[PDB]
Amino acid sequence: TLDTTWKEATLPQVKAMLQKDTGKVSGDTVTYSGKTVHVVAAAVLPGFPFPSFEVHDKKNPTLQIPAGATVDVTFINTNKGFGHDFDITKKGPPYAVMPVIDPIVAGTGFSPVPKDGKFGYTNFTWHPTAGTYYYVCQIPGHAATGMFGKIVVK
Numbered sequence: 001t002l003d004t005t006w007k008e009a010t011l012p013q014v015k016a017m018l019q020k021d022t023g024k025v026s027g028d029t030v031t032y033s034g035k036t037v038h039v040v041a042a043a044v045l046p047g048f049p050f051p052s053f054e055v056h057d058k059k060n061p062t063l064q065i066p067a068g069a070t071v072d073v074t075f076i077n078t079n080k081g082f083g084h085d086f087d088i089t090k091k092g093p094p095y096a097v098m099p100v101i102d103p104i105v106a107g108t109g110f111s112p113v114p115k116d117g118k119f120g121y122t123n124f125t126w127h128p129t130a131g132t133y134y135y136v137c138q139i140p141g142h143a144a145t146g147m148f149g150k151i152v153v154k
């Protein structure tokens, strides 16, 4: 039930997609509003620390999403040498080297490692129920060393 469908994007296409995130930054939180919201996350953008996810040009920010919203997530793997995944779970940190995060409520399989000047990305839709969730990478050791962020659906 994980999303294992990866589309190819060049760097300009990646940038264009990153700019489509509909959240507003305050502090270290990205707040979304409206009936449908579009989260665009990337794994380790240039200039950002490994390992981390970036959303709206912030490092592992907390995503604030309205209860009742349909969440369209775009996940892009911009990180050379790694096939990061993006999985949403109720299980919080700290994470084991091999995270035990079932059930995964929405998310992806492992992404392709970047190649041919191209990056893998994917889109999935999530209809969350109010609560605190986390977006996590399951590549061994990544979540244990900080590759995760929080989602507050309220």
Ligand SMILES: [Cu+2]
Binding pocket: 051, 082, 083, 084, 085, 137, 138, 139, 142, 143, 147
């Ligand atoms: Cu990772």
